[PDB]
RNA sequence: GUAAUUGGAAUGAGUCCACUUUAAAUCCUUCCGCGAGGAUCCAUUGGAGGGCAAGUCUGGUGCCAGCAGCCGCGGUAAUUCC
RNA sequence: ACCAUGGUGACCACGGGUGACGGGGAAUCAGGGUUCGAUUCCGGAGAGGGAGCCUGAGAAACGGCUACCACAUCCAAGGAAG
């Protein structure tokens, strides 16, 4: 059919639970600003690429 | 003892209250806050008196330590120190005695006396037996 | 044109005050029949009880069923339909639960493709609908 | 009723629109080149710099010979000449209207103790102020946003209570003296 | 910045004697003693198509479930759901 | 009491509404405005709803009285106190 009133939660009930894995903790506060000022400005990129964004794949 | 310096400023004597009042600033670099029993015996050897009429209070320490400051004064008689002195700082030392009941107790006693008219043969012992 | 002369401030002021009765945002705020008629009665939230799990069809561009309820308010009791804005949270609610319906976003107009709903449900059975989604809180045993 | 004070105001201001890409990169390089904690305390000094220019540009719309901009204006000059953001030589109503945000972040205690060499690595200077190591003349201060005046600008040093100016080391060295002395010599 | 090895006249949150504070108290300040290597002494709330800063990475679902203030996204390779 | 027939109104009387206590003020901000002010300051009003009084220099008082209306208290049923 077209899903009238049953299967509420149809896709959350059958999504496979990939586990949440853990990482070393994030530097918070004033140190958080330090480690991302240093990633954007004092790290000048050697190559071109039309200034591709900070989340490229 | 080593560095506990007792200075003062804004000194005044007034014979309205028969007192000598001043602002006391205590210089102590590496100690905690000096007690008031430590202070008032040191003004006695500065002002040529005995520590029975020196009443000090209100010491508050600056951020970082060192200079704490409070207000203090000296009377001219311990009889003067019992008349024109508020009763709490007279009692910090053992010169005044204030052991009353709580004001919850005193207020219920007052409204119980109010309901009993006239008789000294019942107002005095109005419900004092249950103890 | 307009009347400009100095001393016509009775005419300019009395004409401005009865021409403000011709837009929405003055007249729905200053007449009184637009606040006697909304179900919250001049409030941002209201409690009510669940009457019927209902499903409404989305608009023609869309094709889905939106999971809604039929809240009947515990204050000045009157019927609304309200949306349960989550994935599986039609199942966290059941018959005659008490809920806290909120506004749906744009003050008495529907948002999105849900035809004729005006409210959304938060806080079913005194626990939050987000907390039941994330699992920070459970339904009361 | 009450004997309460009742007066408070906001020190910052939020921008007119968010997420404009040229603003938050030129205001990132203030958060990191002077090593501040969050962008609210850049909005702090920007709102400081705002109302000074508010007052001053409202003075510049007035001519020559009256009292009130003598009295407000001469005061405004001597109050920010004594703070170090403007020099004592050229104090005018003209030159305050070119005064920038970078001239106020310099006069903080947080970067006047990096450029006097009591700390390297500007982030370390917060880790010395707030962690109780730096005094103004007789008063230790753990507040990095302390805007230091030009008069008491030479007398910044470590405290006599500090590890770096005085004595009685803290618990981390004193643990290290005792740690090999638990069962041995 | 990976990745550390460490350690150092670093320190607080906490714990807790003593003064100070106060009508009496507690706080804040002052100062013994302990108290930091996943410093596990753990930072969250929202977003990531456009407006509007940030992914056409990977799996799952297949106009369903849901998202989306607005335009819109989903019908078997979804940069928009889970 | 005896007389005269007047007063007010499209420059909005009169009636109705107010989710109306008034003001000092508060948020906003090119100027001009728009909105809020129950709320520590001043002024007013009322102590369940009306009404009538005592005393006092000052009250139509309510942690003063009296009566009706509304609600409610103890009782040994006769009464007492809100």
Curated annotation (Swiss-Prot), chain B:
A GO CC annotation given for this chain: cytosol
Gene Ontology molecular function terms on file: RNA binding; structural constituent of ribosome; translation initiation factor binding
Annotated spans, Disordered: 91-131
Pfam families in the cross-refs: Ribosomal_S24e
Subcellular locations according to the entry: Cytoplasm; Nucleus, Nucleolus
UniProt cross-link Glycyl lysine isopeptide (Lys-Gly) (interchain with G-Cter in SUMO2), position: 36
Signal peptide span: none
InterPro entries: eRP_eS24_sf (IPR053709), Ribosomal_eS24 (IPR001976), Ribosomal_eS24_CS (IPR018098), Ribosomal_uL23/eL15/eS24_sf (IPR012678)
Tissue: Mature tissues, such as adult brain, skeletal muscle, heart, and kidney, express low levels, whereas tissues and organs with significant populations of proliferating cells, such as fetal brain, placenta, bone marrow, and various glandular organs, contain significantly higher levels.
Cytoplasm recorded as keyword: yes
Biological processes per GO annotation: cytoplasmic translation; erythrocyte homeostasis; ribosomal small subunit biogenesis; rRNA processing; translation
Biased composition (Basic residues): 100-118
UniProt keyword list: Acetylation, Cytoplasm, Diamond-Blackfan anemia, Isopeptide bond, Nucleus, Phosphoprotein, Ribonucleoprotein, Ribosomal protein, Ubl conjugation
List of residues that carry Phosphothreonine: 8
Disorder this protein is connected to according to its UniProt record: Diamond-Blackfan anemia 3: A form of Diamond-Blackfan anemia, a congenital non-regenerative hypoplastic anemia that usually presents early in infancy. Diamond-Blackfan anemia is characterized by a moderate to severe macrocytic anemia, erythroblastopenia, and an increased risk of developing leukemia. 30 to 40% of Diamond-Blackfan anemia patients present with short stature and congenital anomalies, the most frequent being craniofacial (Pierre-Robin syndrome and cleft palate), thumb and urogenital anomalies.
Stated role: Component of the small ribosomal subunit. The ribosome is a large ribonucleoprotein complex responsible for the synthesis of proteins in the cell. Required for processing of pre-rRNA and maturation of 40S ribosomal subunits. Part of the small subunit (SSU) processome, first precursor of the small eukaryotic ribosomal subunit.
Name of the gene: RPS24
UniProtKB/Swiss-Prot annotation, chain C:
Keywords, in A-Z order: Acetylation, Cytoplasm, Deafness, Disease variant, Dwarfism, Endoplasmic reticulum, Hydroxylation, Isopeptide bond, Nucleus, Ribonucleoprotein, Ribosomal protein, Ubl conjugation
Database matches in Pfam families: Ribosom_S12_S23
Post-translational modification: Hydroxylation at Pro-61 affects translation termination efficiency.
Locations listed in the record: Cytoplasm, Cytosol; Cytoplasm; Rough endoplasmic reticulum; Nucleus, Nucleolus
Span list, region Disordered: 1-25
InterPro entries: NA-bd_OB-fold (IPR012340), Ribosomal_uS12 (IPR006032), Ribosomal_uS12_euk/arc (IPR005680)
Major site of localization recorded for this protein: cytoplasm
An annotated GO BP: translation
Keyword set includes Ubl conjugation: yes
Top-level taxon of the source organism: Eukaryota
Location in chain, cross-link Glycyl lysine isopeptide (Lys-Gly) (interchain with G-Cter in SUMO2): 36
Comp. bias regions, Basic residues: 1-19
Location of N6-acetyllysine modifications: 134
Positions carrying N6-succinyllysine: 53
GO molecular function: RNA binding; structural constituent of ribosome
Residue numbers of 3-hydroxyproline PTMs: 61
GO cellular component annotations of the record: cytoplasm; cytosol; cytosolic ribosome; cytosolic small ribosomal subunit; endoplasmic reticulum; membrane; nucleolus; nucleoplasm
Associated disorder: Brachycephaly, trichomegaly, and developmental delay: An autosomal dominant developmental disorder characterized by brachycephaly, ciliary trichomegaly, dysmorphic features of the face and hands, hearing loss, and developmental delay with short stature. Intellectual disability and autism spectrum disorder may be present in some patients.
Record's function text: Component of the ribosome, a large ribonucleoprotein complex responsible for the synthesis of proteins in the cell. The small ribosomal subunit (SSU) binds messenger RNAs (mRNAs) and translates the encoded message by selecting cognate aminoacyl-transfer RNA (tRNA) molecules. The large subunit (LSU) contains the ribosomal catalytic site termed the peptidyl transferase center (PTC), which catalyzes the formation of peptide bonds, thereby polymerizing the amino acids delivered by tRNAs into a polypeptide chain.
Family classification: Belongs to the universal ribosomal protein uS12 family.
Protein name, entry field: Small ribosomal subunit protein uS12
Organism, scientific name: Homo sapiens (Human)
Curated annotation (Swiss-Prot), chain D:
BP terms from Gene Ontology: cytoplasmic translation; positive regulation of cell population proliferation; ribosomal small subunit biogenesis; translation
Keywords: Acetylation, Cytoplasm, Isopeptide bond, Nucleus, Phosphoprotein, Ribonucleoprotein, Ribosomal protein, RNA-binding, rRNA-binding, Ubl conjugation
Cross-link (Glycyl lysine isopeptide (Lys-Gly) (interchain with G-Cter in SUMO2)): 92, 138
Domain of life: Eukaryota
Residue span(s) of domain S4 RNA-binding: 107-181
Keyword field contains Nucleus: yes
Chain segments carrying region Disordered: 161-185
CC per GO annotation: cytoplasm; cytosol; cytosolic ribosome; cytosolic small ribosomal subunit; extracellular exosome; focal adhesion; membrane; nucleolus
Subcellular location: Cytoplasm; Nucleus, Nucleolus
Main location class: cytoplasm
Cross-referenced CDD domains: S4
Function: Component of the small ribosomal subunit. The ribosome is a large ribonucleoprotein complex responsible for the synthesis of proteins in the cell. Part of the small subunit (SSU) processome, first precursor of the small eukaryotic ribosomal subunit. During the assembly of the SSU processome in the nucleolus, many ribosome biogenesis factors, an RNA chaperone and ribosomal proteins associate with the nascent pre-rRNA and work in concert to generate RNA folding, modifications, rearrangements and cleavage as well as targeted degradation of pre-ribosomal RNA by the RNA exosome.
Subunit structure: Component of the small ribosomal subunit. Identified in a IGF2BP1-dependent mRNP granule complex containing untranslated mRNAs. Part of the small subunit (SSU) processome, composed of more than 70 proteins and the RNA chaperone small nucleolar RNA (snoRNA) U3.
NCBIfam families (alphabetical): PRK04051.1, uS4_arch
Protein name as it appears in the record: Small ribosomal subunit protein uS4
Biological source species: Homo sapiens
Gene that produces this protein: RPS9
């Amino acid at each position: 059919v077209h899903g009238s009133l049953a299967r509420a939660g149809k896709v959350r009930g059958q999504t496979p639970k990939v586990a949440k894995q853990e990482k070393k903790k994030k530097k918070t506060g004033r140190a958080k600003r330090r480690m991302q000022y240093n990633r954007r400005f004092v790290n000048v990129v050697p190559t071109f690429g039309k200034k591709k964004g900070p989340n490229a794949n | 003892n080593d560095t506990v310096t007792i200075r003062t400023r804004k000194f005044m004597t007034n014979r309205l209250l028969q007192r000598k009042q001043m602002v006391i600033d205590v210089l102590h670099p590496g100690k905690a806050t000096v007690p008031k029993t430590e202070i008032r015996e040191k003004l006695a050897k500065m002002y040529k008196t005995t520590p029975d009429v020196i009443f000090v209070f209100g010491f508050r320490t600056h951020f970082g330590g060192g200079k704490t400051t409070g207000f203090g004064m000296i009377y001219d008689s311990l009889d003067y120190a019992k008349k024109n002195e508020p009763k709490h700082r007279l009692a910090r030392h053992g010169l005044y005695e204030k052991k009353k009941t709580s004001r919850k107790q005193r207020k219920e006693r007052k409204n119980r006396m109010k309901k009993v008219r006239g008789t000294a043969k019942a107002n005095v012992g109005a419900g004092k037996k249950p103890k | 044109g307009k009347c400009r002369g100095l001393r016509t401030a009775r005419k300019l002021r009395s004409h401005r005050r009865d021409q403000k009765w011709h837009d929405k945002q003055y007249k729905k705020a200053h007449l009184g029949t637009a606040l006697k008629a909304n179900p919250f009665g001049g409030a941002s939230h209201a409690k009510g009880i669940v009457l019927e799990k209902v499903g409404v069809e989305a608009k023609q561009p869309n094709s889905a069923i939106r999971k809604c309820v039929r809240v009947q308010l515990i204050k000045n009791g009157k019927k609304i339909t309200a949306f349960v804005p989550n994935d599986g949270c039609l199942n966290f609610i059941e018959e005659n639960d008490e809920v806290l319906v909120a506004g749906f976003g744009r003050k008495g107009h529907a948002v999105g493709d849900i035809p004729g709903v005006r409210f959304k449900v938060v806080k079913v059975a005194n626990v939050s609908l987000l907390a039941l989604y994330k699992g920070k809180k459970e339904r009361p045993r | 009723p009450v004997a309460r004070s009742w007066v408070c105001r906001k020190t910052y201001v939020t921008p007119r629109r968010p997420f404009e890409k040229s603003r938050l990169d030129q205001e990132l390089k203030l958060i990191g080149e002077y090593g501040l904690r969050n962008k609210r305390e850049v909005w702090r000094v920007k709102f400081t710099l705002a109302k000074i220019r508010k007052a001053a540009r409202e003075l510049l719309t007035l001519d020559e010979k009256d009292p009130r901009r003598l009295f407000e204006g001469n005061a405004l000059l001597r109050r920010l000449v004594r703070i170090g953001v403007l020099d004592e030589g050229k104090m005018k109503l003209d030159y305050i209207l070119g005064l920038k945000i970078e001239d106020f972040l310099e006069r903080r205690l947080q970067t006047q103790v990096f450029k006097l060499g009591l700390a390297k690595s500007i982030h370390h200077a917060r880790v010395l102020i707030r962690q109780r190591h730096i005094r103004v003349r007789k008063q230790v201060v753990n507040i990095p946003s302390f805007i230091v005046r030009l008069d008491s600008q030479k007398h910044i040093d470590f405290s006599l209570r500090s590890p770096y100016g005085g004595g009685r080391p803290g618990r981390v060295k004193r643990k290290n003296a005792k740690k090999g002395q638990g069962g041995a010599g």
